[PDB]
Coordinates of C-alpha atoms in Angstrom, one line a residue:
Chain P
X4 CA -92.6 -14.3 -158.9
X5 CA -95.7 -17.0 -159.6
X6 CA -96.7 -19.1 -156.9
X7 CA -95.6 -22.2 -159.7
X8 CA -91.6 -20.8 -159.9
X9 CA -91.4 -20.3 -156.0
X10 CA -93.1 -23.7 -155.2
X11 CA -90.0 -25.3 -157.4
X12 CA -87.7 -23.5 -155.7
X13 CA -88.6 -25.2 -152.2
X14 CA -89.0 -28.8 -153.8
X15 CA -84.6 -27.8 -154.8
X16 CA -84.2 -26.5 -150.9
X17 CA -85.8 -29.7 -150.1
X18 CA -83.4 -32.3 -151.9
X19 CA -81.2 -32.2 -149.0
X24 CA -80.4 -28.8 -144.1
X25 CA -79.2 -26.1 -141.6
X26 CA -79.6 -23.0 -144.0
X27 CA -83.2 -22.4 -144.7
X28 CA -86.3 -23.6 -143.0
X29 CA -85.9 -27.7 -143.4
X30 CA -89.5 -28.7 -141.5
X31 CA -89.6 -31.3 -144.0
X32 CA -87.2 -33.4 -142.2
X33 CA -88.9 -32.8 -139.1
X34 CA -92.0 -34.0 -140.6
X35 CA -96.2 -33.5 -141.3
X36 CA -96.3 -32.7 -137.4
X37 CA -94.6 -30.2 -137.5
X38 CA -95.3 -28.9 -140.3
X39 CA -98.8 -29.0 -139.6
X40 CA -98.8 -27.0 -136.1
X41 CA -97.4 -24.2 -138.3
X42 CA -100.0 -24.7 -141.0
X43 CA -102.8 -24.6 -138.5
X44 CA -101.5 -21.7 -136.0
X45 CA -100.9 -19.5 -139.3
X46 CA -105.0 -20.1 -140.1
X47 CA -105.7 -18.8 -136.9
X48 CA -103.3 -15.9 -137.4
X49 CA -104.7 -15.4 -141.1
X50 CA -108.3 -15.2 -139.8
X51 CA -107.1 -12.8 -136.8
X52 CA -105.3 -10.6 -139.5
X53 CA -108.4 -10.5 -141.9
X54 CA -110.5 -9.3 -138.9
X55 CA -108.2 -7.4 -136.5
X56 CA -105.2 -6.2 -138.7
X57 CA -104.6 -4.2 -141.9
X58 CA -104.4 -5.3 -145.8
X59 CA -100.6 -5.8 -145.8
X60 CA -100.6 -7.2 -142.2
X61 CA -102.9 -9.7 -143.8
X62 CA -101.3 -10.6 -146.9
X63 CA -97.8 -11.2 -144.9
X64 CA -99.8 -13.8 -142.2
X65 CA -101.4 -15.2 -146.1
X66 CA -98.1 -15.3 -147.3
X67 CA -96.5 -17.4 -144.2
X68 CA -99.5 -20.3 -144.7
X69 CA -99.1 -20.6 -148.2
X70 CA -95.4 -21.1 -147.9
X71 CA -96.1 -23.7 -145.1
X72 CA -98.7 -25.4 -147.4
X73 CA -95.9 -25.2 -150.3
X74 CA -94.0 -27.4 -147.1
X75 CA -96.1 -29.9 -146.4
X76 CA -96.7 -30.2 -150.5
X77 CA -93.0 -30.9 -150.6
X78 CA -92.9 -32.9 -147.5
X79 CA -95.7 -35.7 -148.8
X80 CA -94.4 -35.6 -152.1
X81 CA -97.7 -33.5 -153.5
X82 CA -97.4 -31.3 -156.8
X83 CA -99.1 -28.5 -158.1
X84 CA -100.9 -30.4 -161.1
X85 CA -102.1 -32.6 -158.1
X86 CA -103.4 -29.9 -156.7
X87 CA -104.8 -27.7 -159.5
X88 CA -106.2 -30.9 -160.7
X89 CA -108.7 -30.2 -157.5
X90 CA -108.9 -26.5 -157.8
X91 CA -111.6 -26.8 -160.2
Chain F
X4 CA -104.8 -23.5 -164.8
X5 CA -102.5 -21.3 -163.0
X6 CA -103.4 -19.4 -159.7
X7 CA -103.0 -16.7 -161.0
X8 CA -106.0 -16.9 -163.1
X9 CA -108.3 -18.9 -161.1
X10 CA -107.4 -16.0 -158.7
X11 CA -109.1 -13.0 -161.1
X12 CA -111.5 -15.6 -162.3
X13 CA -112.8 -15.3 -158.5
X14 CA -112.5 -11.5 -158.7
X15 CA -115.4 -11.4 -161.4
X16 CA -117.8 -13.4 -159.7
X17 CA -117.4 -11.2 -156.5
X18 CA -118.3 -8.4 -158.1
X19 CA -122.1 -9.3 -157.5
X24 CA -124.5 -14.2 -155.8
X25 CA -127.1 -17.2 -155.3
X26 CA -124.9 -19.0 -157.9
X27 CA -121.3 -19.7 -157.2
X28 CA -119.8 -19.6 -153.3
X29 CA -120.8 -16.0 -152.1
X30 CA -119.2 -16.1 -148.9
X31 CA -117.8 -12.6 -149.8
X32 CA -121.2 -11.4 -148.8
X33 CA -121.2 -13.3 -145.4
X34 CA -117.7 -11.8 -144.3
X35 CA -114.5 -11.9 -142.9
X36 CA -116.1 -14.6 -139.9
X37 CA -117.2 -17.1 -142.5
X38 CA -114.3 -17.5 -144.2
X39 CA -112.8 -17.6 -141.4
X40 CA -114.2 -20.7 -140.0
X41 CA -113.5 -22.6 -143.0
X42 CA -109.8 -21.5 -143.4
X43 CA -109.3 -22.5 -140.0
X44 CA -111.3 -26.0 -140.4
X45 CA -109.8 -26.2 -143.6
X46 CA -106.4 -25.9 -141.9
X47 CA -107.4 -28.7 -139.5
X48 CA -108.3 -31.2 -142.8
X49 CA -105.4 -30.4 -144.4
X50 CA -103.3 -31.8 -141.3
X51 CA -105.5 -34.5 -140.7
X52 CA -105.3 -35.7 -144.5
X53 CA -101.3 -35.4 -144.5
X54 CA -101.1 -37.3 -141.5
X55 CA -103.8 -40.4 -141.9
X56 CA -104.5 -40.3 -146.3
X57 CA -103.3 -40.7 -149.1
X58 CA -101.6 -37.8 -151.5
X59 CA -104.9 -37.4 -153.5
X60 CA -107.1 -36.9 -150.4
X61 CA -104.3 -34.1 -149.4
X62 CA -104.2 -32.3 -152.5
X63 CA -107.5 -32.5 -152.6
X64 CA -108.1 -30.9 -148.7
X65 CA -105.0 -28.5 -149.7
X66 CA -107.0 -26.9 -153.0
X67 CA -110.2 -26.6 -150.8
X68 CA -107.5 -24.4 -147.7
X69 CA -106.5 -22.3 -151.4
X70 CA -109.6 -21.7 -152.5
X71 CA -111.1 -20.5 -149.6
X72 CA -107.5 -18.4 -149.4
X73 CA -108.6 -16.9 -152.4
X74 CA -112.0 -16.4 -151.3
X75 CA -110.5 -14.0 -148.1
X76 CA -108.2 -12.3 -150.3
X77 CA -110.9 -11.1 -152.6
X78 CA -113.1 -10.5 -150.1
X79 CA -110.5 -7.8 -148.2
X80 CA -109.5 -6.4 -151.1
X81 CA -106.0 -8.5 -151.1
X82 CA -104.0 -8.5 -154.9
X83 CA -101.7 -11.5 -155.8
X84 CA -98.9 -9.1 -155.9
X85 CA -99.3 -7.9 -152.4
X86 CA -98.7 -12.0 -151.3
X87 CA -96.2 -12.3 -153.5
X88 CA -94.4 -9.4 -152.7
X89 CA -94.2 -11.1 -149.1
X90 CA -93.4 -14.7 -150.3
X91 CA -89.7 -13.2 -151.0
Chain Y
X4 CA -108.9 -34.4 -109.2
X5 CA -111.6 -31.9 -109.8
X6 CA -111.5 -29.2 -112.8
X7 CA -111.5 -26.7 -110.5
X8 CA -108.7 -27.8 -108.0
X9 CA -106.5 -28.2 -111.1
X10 CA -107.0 -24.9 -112.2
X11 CA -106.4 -23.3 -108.5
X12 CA -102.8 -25.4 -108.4
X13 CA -101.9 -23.1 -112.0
X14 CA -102.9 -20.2 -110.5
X15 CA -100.3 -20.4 -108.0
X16 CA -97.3 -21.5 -109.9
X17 CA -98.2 -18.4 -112.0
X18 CA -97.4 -16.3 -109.2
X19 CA -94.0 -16.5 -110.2
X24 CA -90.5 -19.9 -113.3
X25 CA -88.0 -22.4 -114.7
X26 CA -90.1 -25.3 -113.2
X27 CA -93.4 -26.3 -114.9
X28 CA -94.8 -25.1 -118.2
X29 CA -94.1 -20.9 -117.9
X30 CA -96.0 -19.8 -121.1
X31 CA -97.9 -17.0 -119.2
X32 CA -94.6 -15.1 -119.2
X33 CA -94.2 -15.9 -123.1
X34 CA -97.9 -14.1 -123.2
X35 CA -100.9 -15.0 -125.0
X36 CA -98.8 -15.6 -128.5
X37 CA -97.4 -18.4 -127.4
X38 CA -100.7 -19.6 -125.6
X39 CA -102.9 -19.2 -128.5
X40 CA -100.3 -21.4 -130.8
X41 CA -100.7 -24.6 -129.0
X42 CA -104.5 -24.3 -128.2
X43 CA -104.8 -23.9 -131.8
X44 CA -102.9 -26.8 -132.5
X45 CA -104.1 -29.2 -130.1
X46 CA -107.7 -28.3 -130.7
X47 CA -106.6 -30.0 -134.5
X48 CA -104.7 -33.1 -132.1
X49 CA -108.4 -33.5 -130.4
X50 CA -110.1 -33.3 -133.9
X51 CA -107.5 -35.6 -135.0
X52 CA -107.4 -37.8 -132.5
X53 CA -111.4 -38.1 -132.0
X54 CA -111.4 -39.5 -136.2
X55 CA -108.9 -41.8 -136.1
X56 CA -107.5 -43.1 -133.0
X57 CA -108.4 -44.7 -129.7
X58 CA -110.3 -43.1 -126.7
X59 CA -107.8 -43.1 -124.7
X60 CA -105.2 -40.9 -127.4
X61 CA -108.5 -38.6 -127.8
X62 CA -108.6 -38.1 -123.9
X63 CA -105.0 -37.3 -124.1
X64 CA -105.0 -35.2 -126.4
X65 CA -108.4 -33.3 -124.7
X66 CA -106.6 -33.0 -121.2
X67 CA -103.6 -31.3 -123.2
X68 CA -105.9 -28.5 -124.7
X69 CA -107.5 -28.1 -121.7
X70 CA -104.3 -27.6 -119.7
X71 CA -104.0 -25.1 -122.4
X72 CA -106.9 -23.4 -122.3
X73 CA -106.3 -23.1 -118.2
X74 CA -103.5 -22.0 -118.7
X75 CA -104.8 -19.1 -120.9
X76 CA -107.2 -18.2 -118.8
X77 CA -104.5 -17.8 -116.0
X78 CA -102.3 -15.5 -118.6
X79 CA -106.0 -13.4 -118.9
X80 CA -106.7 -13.4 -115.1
X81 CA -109.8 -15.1 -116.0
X82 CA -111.9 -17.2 -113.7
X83 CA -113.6 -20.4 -113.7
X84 CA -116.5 -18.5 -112.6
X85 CA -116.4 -15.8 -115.4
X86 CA -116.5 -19.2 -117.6
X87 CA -119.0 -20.8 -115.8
X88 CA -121.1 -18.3 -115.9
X89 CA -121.3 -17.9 -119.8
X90 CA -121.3 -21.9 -119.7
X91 CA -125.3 -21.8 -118.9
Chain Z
X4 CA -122.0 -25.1 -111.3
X5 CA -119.4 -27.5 -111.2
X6 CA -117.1 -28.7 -114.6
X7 CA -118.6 -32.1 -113.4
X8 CA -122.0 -31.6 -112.9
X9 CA -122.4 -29.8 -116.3
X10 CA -120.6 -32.9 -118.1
X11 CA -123.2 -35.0 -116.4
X12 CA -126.1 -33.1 -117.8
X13 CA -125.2 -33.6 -121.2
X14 CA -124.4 -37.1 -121.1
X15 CA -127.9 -37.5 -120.4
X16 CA -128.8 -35.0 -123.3
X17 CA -127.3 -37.2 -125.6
X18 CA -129.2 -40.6 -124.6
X19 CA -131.7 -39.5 -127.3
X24 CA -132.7 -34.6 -130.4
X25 CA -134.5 -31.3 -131.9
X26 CA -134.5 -29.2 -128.2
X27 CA -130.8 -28.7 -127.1
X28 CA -127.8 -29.3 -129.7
X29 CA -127.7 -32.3 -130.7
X30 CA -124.0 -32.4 -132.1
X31 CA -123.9 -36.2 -131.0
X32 CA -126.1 -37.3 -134.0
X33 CA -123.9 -35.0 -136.9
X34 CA -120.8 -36.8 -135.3
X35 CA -117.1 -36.2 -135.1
X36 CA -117.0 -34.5 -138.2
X37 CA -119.4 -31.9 -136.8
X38 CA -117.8 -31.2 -133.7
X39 CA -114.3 -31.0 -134.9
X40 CA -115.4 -28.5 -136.9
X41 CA -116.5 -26.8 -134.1
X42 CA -113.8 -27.1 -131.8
X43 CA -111.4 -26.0 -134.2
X44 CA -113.2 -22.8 -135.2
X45 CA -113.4 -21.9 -131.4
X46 CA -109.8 -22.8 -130.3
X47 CA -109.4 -20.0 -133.0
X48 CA -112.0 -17.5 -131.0
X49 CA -110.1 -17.9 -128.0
X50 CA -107.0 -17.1 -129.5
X51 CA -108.5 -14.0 -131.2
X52 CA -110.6 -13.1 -128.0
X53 CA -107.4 -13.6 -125.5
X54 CA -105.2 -11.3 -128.1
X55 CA -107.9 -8.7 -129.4
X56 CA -111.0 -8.3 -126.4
X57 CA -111.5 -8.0 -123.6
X58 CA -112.0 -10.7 -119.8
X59 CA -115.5 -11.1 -120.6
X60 CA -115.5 -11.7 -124.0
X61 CA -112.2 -14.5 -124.1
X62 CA -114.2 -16.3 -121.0
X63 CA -117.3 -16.2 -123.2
X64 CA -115.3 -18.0 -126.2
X65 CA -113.7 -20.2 -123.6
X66 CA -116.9 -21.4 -122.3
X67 CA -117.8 -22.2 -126.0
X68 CA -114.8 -24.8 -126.7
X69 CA -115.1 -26.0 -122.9
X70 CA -119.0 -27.1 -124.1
X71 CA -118.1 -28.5 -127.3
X72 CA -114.7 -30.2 -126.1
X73 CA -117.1 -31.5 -123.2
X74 CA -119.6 -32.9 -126.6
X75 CA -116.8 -34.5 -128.0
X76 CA -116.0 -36.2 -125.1
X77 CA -119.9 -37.3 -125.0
X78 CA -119.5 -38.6 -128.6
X79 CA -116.7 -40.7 -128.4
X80 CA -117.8 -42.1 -124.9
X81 CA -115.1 -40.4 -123.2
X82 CA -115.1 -39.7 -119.5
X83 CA -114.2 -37.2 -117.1
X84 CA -112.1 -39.7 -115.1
X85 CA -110.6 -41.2 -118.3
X86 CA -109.1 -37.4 -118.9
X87 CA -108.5 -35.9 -115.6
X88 CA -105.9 -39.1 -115.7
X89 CA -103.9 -37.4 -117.8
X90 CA -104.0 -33.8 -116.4
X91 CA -101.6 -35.6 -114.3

């Protein structure tokens, strides 16, 4: 349930295809597109929408930040290192 | 270290400002523009730089993540809850 | 070859599909994702390539943004108008 | 009134600073930031307001695309190539 056990989970999902979600093999590009439209779609939710309806378009970029983590090799001690 | 508690470490300081990042008191629109530019970084830096300069974009898109949740009233479990 | 004789051409293929680029009948959605994401290609592009991939990329979110305008019955002179 | 006539008119704005916005000076960095934030307006505006108020966020990231073609020495003729 922490954003640490689920992030480990993808790197797993990530180690090879066709069942879940495997942007990493088609690449940042892609990747990024769906980090950037879900921004958008996270700053129309927090205006626009509900709580839950915003916490479910939060939920989609975090996951596609988890992917592009994965997809340049990026870890969450990398990350946390910067989060202070 | 964990999000978790960097998450209700944020919490605190919202409850008041002139100290620590008070967008909170701006609004939904200014953290809005920097999730969405932040977004646009993040890309940019997994594309063109290294993996530092991307972790260090990607805790800067979190943080200000963090910094919407708080400010609509968004808990870690409603996220996570979505995440599955 | 002018902006506004462009715009007149999209006008009338969106009187009607399987030709050119139909995203008025996939609706704003679908719109708003690549004007999004292309806005991060120009911003992108402008940094760290040439001028010619930044005009590239700038005549794609333009396109885009036409093409929205189209979807919204919009005008170039509703747009003009604000543009002074 | 013309796409090309106001493209002129800051290109001449931009030979030298304090009266009209003088993104030119700030640079890339500045502008990105800006387009990126209004690509996100349009989205919102197209999805959530009304005509008026998605041509008036249009008109926005027409200007500042327009600026970013100003500071990277872009022309009109250099991207109408490519709306081809």
């Amino acid at each position: 349930k922490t954003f640490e056990e689920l992030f480990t989970e993808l790197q797993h999902k990530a180690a090879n295809t066709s069942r879940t979600a495997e942007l990493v093999d088609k690449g940042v590009h892609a990747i990024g597109k769906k980090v950037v439209e879900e921004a958008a779609e996270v700053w129309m939710a927090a205006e626009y929408e509900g709580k839950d309806a915003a916490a479910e378009e939060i939920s989609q970029l975090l996951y596609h930040v988890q992917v592009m983590m994965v997809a340049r090799g990026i870890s969450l001690d990398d990350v946390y290192a910067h989060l202070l």
